[PDB]
Known about the structure:
Chain C: This is Major capsid protein. The structure is cut from a larger assembly and holds 3 copies of chain A. Chain A is built from 1 helix and no strands. By secondary structure, chain A is low in regular secondary structure.
Amino acid sequence: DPPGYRYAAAMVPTGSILSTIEVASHRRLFDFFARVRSDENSLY
Amino acid sequence: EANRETLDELESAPQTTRVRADLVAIGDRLVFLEALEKRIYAATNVPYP
Amino acid sequence: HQPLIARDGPHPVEQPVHNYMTKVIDRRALNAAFSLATEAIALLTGEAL
């Protein structure tokens, strides 16, 4: 349902997240939430 | 000689740097007082030992 | 090398003592996994270019 994360505009970020937290703890916050192993194809 | 030159003493000192770590004086002793679970074990599901 | 304190009779007369001791190394390992993906290989190689 939700639109994919846009990888090409993350290559130039606006700003850095300060916190360090396990993100999957609270999943319900997000819209599109992807969890990835070392690498995948989609990124490419 | 009943007393010798300790083989480790013959080594020169390694280079030292200035690091930030809390040094507590307990009794007569200096001790690093450290809780690691921030530096390490943060957002890594391994539980704190 | 343990020391001696010379006692008096009638305590049985003690002698100097020495301890000769060795240990064995206990061996271990650590692990990490780097895994890549195919289309990330076909790029770096210079194929899909």
